[PDB]
Amino acid sequence: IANQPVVIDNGSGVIKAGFAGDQIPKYCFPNYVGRPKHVRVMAGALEGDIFIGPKAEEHRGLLSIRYPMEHGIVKDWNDMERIWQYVYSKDQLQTFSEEHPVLLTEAPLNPRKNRERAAEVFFETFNVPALFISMQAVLSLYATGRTTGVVLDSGDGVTHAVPIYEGFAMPHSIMRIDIAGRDVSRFLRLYLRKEGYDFHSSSEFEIVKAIKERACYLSINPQKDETLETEKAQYYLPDGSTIEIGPSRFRAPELLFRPDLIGEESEGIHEVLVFAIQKSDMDLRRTLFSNIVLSGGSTLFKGFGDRLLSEVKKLAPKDVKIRISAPQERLYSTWIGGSILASLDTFKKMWVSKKEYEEDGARSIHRKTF
Amino acid sequence: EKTAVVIDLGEAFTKCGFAGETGPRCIIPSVIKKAGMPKPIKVVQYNINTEELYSYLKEFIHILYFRHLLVNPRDRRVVVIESVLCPSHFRETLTRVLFKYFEVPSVLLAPSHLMALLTLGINSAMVLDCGYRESLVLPIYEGIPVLNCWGALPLGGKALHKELETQLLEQCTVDTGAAKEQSLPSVMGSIPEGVLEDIKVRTCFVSDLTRGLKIQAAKFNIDGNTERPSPPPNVDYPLDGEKILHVLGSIRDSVVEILFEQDNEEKSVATLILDSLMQCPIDTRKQLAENLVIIGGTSMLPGFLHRLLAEIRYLVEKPKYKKTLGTKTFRIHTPPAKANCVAWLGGAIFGALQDILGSRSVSKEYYNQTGRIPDWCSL
Amino acid sequence: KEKVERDRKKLARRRNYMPLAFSQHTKEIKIEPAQAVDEVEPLPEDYYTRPVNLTEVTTLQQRLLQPDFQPICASQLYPRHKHLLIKRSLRCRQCEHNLSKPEFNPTSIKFKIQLVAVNY
Amino acid sequence: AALVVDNGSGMCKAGFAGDDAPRAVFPSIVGRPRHQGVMVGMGQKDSYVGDEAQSKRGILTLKYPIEHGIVTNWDDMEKIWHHTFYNELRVAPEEHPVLLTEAPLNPKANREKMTQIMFETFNTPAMYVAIQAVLSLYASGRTTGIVMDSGDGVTHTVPIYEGYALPHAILRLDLAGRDLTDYLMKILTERGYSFTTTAEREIVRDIKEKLCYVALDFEQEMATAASSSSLEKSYELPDGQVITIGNERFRCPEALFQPSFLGMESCGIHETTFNSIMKCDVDIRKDLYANTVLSGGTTMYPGIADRMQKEITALAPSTMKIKIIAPPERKYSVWIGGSILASLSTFQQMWISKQEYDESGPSIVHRKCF
Ligand SMILES: Nc1ncnc2c1ncn2[C@@H]1O[C@H](COP(=O)(O)OP(=O)(O)OP(=O)(O)O)[C@@H](O)[C@H]1O
Ligand SMILES: Nc1ncnc2c1ncn2[C@@H]1O[C@H](COP(=O)(O)OP(=O)(O)O)[C@@H](O)[C@H]1O
Ligand SMILES: Nc1ncnc2c1ncn2[C@@H]1O[C@H](COP(=O)(O)OP(=O)(O)O)[C@@H](O)[C@H]1O
Ligand SMILES: [Zn+2]
């Protein structure tokens, strides 16, 4: 069917939907299911037992937040079906899923059962004309408009580094670590309890993510800022109460660059970028260092590019040019890539038709992926 | 060398005594009776000005070191037991009081969970700490606390005391002694915390899982006609002499259920062990599960350990925990001292080790030089 | 063992010989760890359908005065020995001595060295 | 009285010369704890080694000191040798002379620094380094024939005819047990079961050793794996959790025979064994086909010998008879050779003494290596 394809980013934190024609995603809402915290027997309470996106944000304190997708993998599929149904609601897009074809953006090196079940839902529950699963990293390059480039895509659920040179992705050089934005939000909650402010509730976890997003700066030297006495910058909560964050502000997102501090066995965001380049062939190393692209929401931390440049330089070889080319629209970069890809006439060949999936089998989605 | 003193500053009660003893010498409510104030102010209070906190701790430590313990503070060392993720400014103040005013030789800031493990003798064990403020859990594997897989919920003494006060005010039946033989509701606007605590301990008990699960659905009244078990007999409690409060049988076995209630989120005192254990490393699972430790005075409540261990094994079969923690054998450790004084006993056992104490502990000469207490946060 | 290890490590750092092997390098006490019970004793069925006398059960205050084995029942609760009191002596930061009390403070209101702001 | 100490990348096999099997066999690893700023409990060792670190895997970060038969961290290797002599063997290194094993075509600094430690740190009376492949022949009572000694670190092919080695015919391949273990993690992550940490990698090695087997026809085995669930076997982890690895069982050891899977762009363990024989003189080829030995624990895969024979026979001429020599004790084939060599009265002269080391230096080893 010729009618405009619907791009949808499967972001663990925030799913971004919209049409391929639009330069930006019109409808982007948080990826969580909202049910009433108190188990509702009586009338005059929150009805439906389902609150998604803007409806949830309004009555947030009353509801109990449950993320359906963890570490770029779908844990509860029933929840994810309701989320994708809300994408084709009167609230967002307001269209038939049966008419328009779909593009998914699954993280690299995900389970094959995750891709197979994702297709089954979108072909059976929704009567889609055609579906195409793609890598988040490959899209990010289409948006910026360069063929060569390493893509350090720090999402909410997963942070992954994929090196692609002249439209060729080395699949062995891909590096994936689970320590992402959501873990930084979890570790900030621990440090906030060490400052003396508890956020025990699942609703109260959402305002820790807001505190992180508002006020958390990455110091170039962490040891000097610790010895220096903090200003203790006040943050205002939804109720109106003030909280002085203090040293927790800067030593929370540090755990990205040094995850051994809390006690998580991972490489680190500076390390995975360098290791991904060093794993690739010697001839390409210089060009891959010379073309690095930051993607996702967990790069927007104040002074992230400043710290990463410094942490990469000392690990990388001496007298090598390191350009970390961040776009202005890092959060919405992954979708814009899909929107451009979808618009091209080549995409018509790439996607798998509904009749193709019935005849060919299950492999059809996997083999056409690349 | 002299036998080092052990102090354990809590919101409800403080444990005090000397190292290498069977239990604590003095255990008292963590308050101070200041002139003018009718009700005594609580000594540990998080999120206040440092100068006001300094004065309260100076007043309290003085009472511990002279009226309760009889020993010179400057002469012998200190082993300060405090829970992990204790507020930064509070711990900084407590040390600054001991080092500046009292001029103690050296303080050792031991985490309560690692101390509780020493008392049993086992090197690795899961430790739940159901205290006053928050019921915290922290897996300890072969001497190393795993901060990565922490867990805390506000389902302790404070949350239970508040729940009791609410229920009593609804079904309020007091005999004032002024033509008040007939049921008189809410004669007093608020009930003092000292009374509520005494009612909780004597009257209220923890129900069986089978009876408790019925009580949860009963008070909910989820499309059912009077589906509650038969309650215990109503106990009459004296308030301030003449006033006799008749405590309803339902309140006794329903007040506790707020701890073990699911409340949609799936966040109980029971769930917190399994939520933490599932997040732990794959190799450590079977060792931690087999070695459970239940400290804190909230777990002293009669029939708490049976309900918890039962509620665990029920929540195991639930589909979320069924995959990972399905075929696991959960066995509880019985510590030598009572559930309240497990934390203290560890510090005393550690305090008896004079050789290791001096090395690990922070000396006054170091603090006066630097002015930087070591913590699990960055240096 | 840790003291000997820490001492051996510290004198090796102080020596600064880079762990030079001049000589050859390198009875045990084993406690049995407490056995974990499969099922803890349940709450007795007496507690259900029995009048609770507040005289028989003990309050928190009198429970906690006997901390070594704080008993719920009154019949278990034994009388503890009477707590000894203290005779304070004050010493300043800059000054050395200030005031003190006799060796027979029992049944005496005499100060060995009387010093107070009202007396100067 | 003499000591044989195999310095394998996977496992360190140590024992007394003359004995049938090695006394102490432990995994060659150093376990440093994921420590926070929180104080540690009692009975605390700063760095654990071997069977102790294998017991306390959960918390300790496992770091293999030898990578591809090259000692990367010498301070770590020193702590293993200290655990080998003093604790494991219960013997003084000053009394007994120590035979060590190095893989062929290793860096010269490796052999140089190895002996320097043995002479200075441990103060051994004599030290001789030997090629692992040269020892492995003595195990089978064969002077003539090639060996395919595939270890955890490296795999090497050393052709030796009538007690004379062909040095130029020796070929080294970096593909080995640890690369297969790393490969098995990736394909298990594709199935669903994610293994990231260093402790988890050790559990994946236990899965590999027990289940994984070499297929005769890979394409035929993949067809049976797709149709029927007969090849699918269950394994219990340290946790009660059980996993069904499926087709990935026989997919892991395939990487040996076709490195393209791992993405090395090199010849297979079958093809390198053929290439090594062709590099040798035309006359002696006959005996090398007739006496092809498989050594190390990477040749203890069920049915590698059958697959090896098939692949060599196809490449080799039709008239030639290809017999693969697979003794029951392949894992201890390097050590048992060392025990036979050290015991022989002829070898008494070949030892490098302290006096010889003191006068000449550490460079003497390169002359009296092989
Ligand atoms: N029965 C088995 N089946 C399959 N793989 C095995 C088996 N036993 C061991 N392995 C794998 O092969 C490796 C064999 O290591 P081994 O014990 O031979 O020591 P090594 O370090 O390779 O020594 P060397 O290089 O001297 O042979 C192990 O690390 C493991 O990954
Ligand atoms: N301005 C910001 N500053 C700091 N962190 C941010 C900011 N915006 C988003 N984040 C973090 O990044 C997350 C968004 O990740 P996102 O880019 O949507 O991932 P994905 O690429 O998988 O869609 C948020 O949940 C939050 O943790
Ligand atoms: N022996 C007991 N029996 C029953 N309940 C008790 C007992 N001792 C204490 N409690 C209750 O449990 C709580 C235990 O708190 P505690 O652990 O002493 O304080 P903290 O957590 O601040 O160290 C008290 O506030 C009290 O309500
Ligand atoms: Zn003076």
User: What are the structural domains of chain A?
Assistant: 1-136+334-368 (3.30.420.40), 137-178+267-333 (3.30.420.40), 179-266 (3.90.640.10)
The angstrom resolution of this structure is: 8.2
What is the distance between the alpha carbons of residues A341 and A215, in angstroms, rounded to a whole number?
35
> DSSP 3-state assignment of D59?
coil
Look up residue D139 and give its two tokens: 């195990």
Structural Rg of chain D based on CA atoms: 21
Directed axis angle between helix D132-139 and helix D333-343, to 10°? 80
Residues having CB within 6 Å of any atom of ligand 3: B 10-13, 131-132, 157, 197, 201, 296-298, 300-301, 340; C 63, 70
State the nearest Cα–Cα gap between C39 and chain D, in angstroms. 20
Ligand 2 contact via A213 beta carbon (within 6 Å):
yes
Q: How many CB atoms lie within 10 A of CB D168?
A: 8
Instruction: Find which of D32, D34, D59 to mutate to test the A interface (most A CBs within 10 Å of its CB).
Output: D34
Shortest-distance atom of ligand 2 to CA A330: 17
Q: Are β-strands B126-130 and B292-295 bridged in parallel, bridged antiparallel, or unpaired?
A: parallel
> DSSP 3-state assignment of A279?
helix
Residue A7 φ/ψ, nearest 5 degrees: -75, 140
What is the distance between the alpha carbons of residues D64 and D57, in angstroms, rounded to a whole number?
13
- Of A96, A97, A122, A103, which Cα lies nearest the Cα of A25? A103
What is the distance between the alpha carbons of residues A175 and A162, in angstroms, rounded to a whole number?
7
Q: Give the angle B333-B336-B340 at the CA atoms, nearest 5°.
A: 85
Look up residue A96 and give its two tokens: 């038939």
Beta bridge partners of D31: D48, D62
Token match 């959790």: residue?
Answer: D241
Q: How many CB atoms lie within 10 A of CB B31?
A: 19
What separation in angstroms does the CA of B150 have from each of B129, C24, D300?
12, 45, 43
Residue A244 φ/ψ, nearest 5 degrees: -90, 110
Experimental method used, please?
Answer: cryo-EM
Shortest-distance atom of ligand 1 to CA D6: 26
> DSSP 3-state assignment of A58?
helix
State the nearest Cα–Cα gap between A285 and chain D, in angstroms. 17
Q: Which residues of A touch D61 (CB under 8 A)?
A: 265
Token match 């997102």: residue?
Answer: A253
Q: Does D42 touch chain B (CB under 8 A)?
A: yes
* Secondary structure element (H or E) that encloses residue A130, with its range: strand A130-135
CB contact burial B144-169 (16+ within 10 A = b; e otherwise): bbbbbbbbbbebbbbbbbebbbebbe
Contacts by residues B179-183 (CB-CB < 8 Å, ≥ 24 positions apart) = B180/B243, B183/B246
Do residue B134 and residue A198 have CB atoms under 8 angstroms apart? yes
Residues having CB within 6 Å of any atom of ligand 1: D 6, 8-11, 101, 132, 151-153, 177, 181, 205, 208-209, 296-298, 300-301, 331, 334
- Find the C95 Cα to ligand 4 centroid distance in Å: 4
Ligand 2 contact via A337 beta carbon (within 6 Å):
no
Nearest CA in chain D to C5: D45
- Of A181, A177, A136, A174, which Cα lies nearest the Cα of A155? A181
Task: State the DSSP string of C29-68.
Answer: --PPPPPPBSSPPPPPTTSSS----TTTBPPHHHHHTS-T
Q: Does D86 touch chain C (CB under 8 A)?
A: yes
User: Taking the alpha carbons of C96, C97, C103, C107 in that order, is the dihedral positive or negative?
Assistant: negative
Directed axis angle between helix A181-195 and helix A202-214, to 10°? 100
In contact, A354 and A128? CB cutoff 8 Å: yes
Single-letter code of the amino acid located at B360: R
User: What are the structural domains of chain D?
Assistant: 1-132+334-370 (3.30.420.40), 133-174+268-333 (3.30.420.40), 175-266 (3.90.640.10)
Q: Which residue CA neighbors atom 5 of ligand 2 most closely?
A: A213
SS (H, E, C) chain B: CCCCEEEECCCCEEEEEECCCCCCCEEEECEECCCCCCCCEECCCCCCCHHHHHHHHHHHHHHHHHHHCCCCCCCCCEEEEECCCCCHHHHHHHHHHHHHHHCCCEECCEEHHHHHHHHHCCCCEEEEEECCCCEEECCEECCEECHHHCEEECCCHHHHHHHHHHHHHHCCCEECCCCCCCCECCCCCCCCHHHHHHHHHHCCCCCCHHHHHHHHHHHHCCCCCCCCCCCCCCEEEEECCCEEEEECHHHHHHCCHHHHCCCCCCCCHHHHHHHHHHHCCCCCHHHHHHCEEEECHHHHCCCHHHHHHHHHHHHHHCHHHHCCCCCCCCCECCCCCCHHHCHHHHHHHHHCCHHHHHHHCEEHHHHHHHCCCCCCCCC
Instruction: Find which of B88, B322, B378 to mutate to test the A interface (most A CBs within 10 Å of its CB).
Output: B378
In contact, A254 and A218? CB cutoff 8 Å: yes
Cα first-last separation, chain B: 31
- Find the C120 Cα to ligand 4 centroid distance in Å: 14
Mutate to test the pocket of ligand 1, among D64, D154, D298 (most ligand atoms within 8 A of CB): D298
- Find the A21 Cα to ligand 2 centroid distance in Å: 24
What is the distance between the alpha carbons of residues A209 and B87, in angstroms, rounded to a whole number?
21
Q: How many CB atoms lie within 10 A of CB C84?
A: 6
Counted across chains C and D, CB pairs separated by less than 8 A come out at 13
Q: Give the ligand whose atoms come closest to the C-alpha of residue C90.
A: 4
Q: Does C106 touch chain B (CB under 8 A)?
A: no
In contact, A197 and B134? CB cutoff 8 Å: no
In contact, B314 and B84? CB cutoff 8 Å: no
What is the distance between the alpha carbons of residues D339 and D344, in angstroms, rounded to a whole number?
9
Shortest-distance atom of ligand 3 to CA B298: 12
Residues 8-37, chain D: which have Cβ within 8 Å of B? 33-37
Q: How many CB atoms lie within 10 A of CB B285?
A: 21
- Find the A330 Cα to ligand 2 centroid distance in Å: 9
Residues 185-244, chain D: which have Cβ within 8 Å of A? 186, 189-192, 194, 196-199
What is the distance between the alpha carbons of residues B80 and D161, in angstroms, rounded to a whole number?
74
The single-letter DSSP state of residue A169 is B
What is the distance between the alpha carbons of residues B244 and D296, in angstroms, rounded to a whole number?
84
User: Taking the alpha carbons of B69, B74, B79, B83 in that order, is the dihedral positive or negative?
Assistant: positive
- Of A156, A182, A177, which Cα lies nearest the Cα of A275? A177
In contact, A155 and A179? CB cutoff 8 Å: no
What is the distance between the alpha carbons of residues B186 and A177, in angstroms, rounded to a whole number?
58
Single-letter code of the amino acid located at D166: L
What is the distance between the alpha carbons of residues C7 and C1, in angstroms, rounded to a whole number?
10
Token match 């079961």: residue?
Answer: D193
Residues, chain A, total? 370
Q: Which residues of D touch C25 (CB under 8 A)?
A: 82, 86
Do residue C34 and residue B121 have CB atoms under 8 angstroms apart? yes
State the nearest Cα–Cα gap between B211 and chain D, in angstroms. 31
Look up residue D236 and give its two tokens: 């219990």
Q: Which residue CA neighbors atom 9 of ligand 1 most closely?
A: D297
Token match 């770029």: residue?
Answer: A72
Token match 């007043």: residue?
Answer: B59
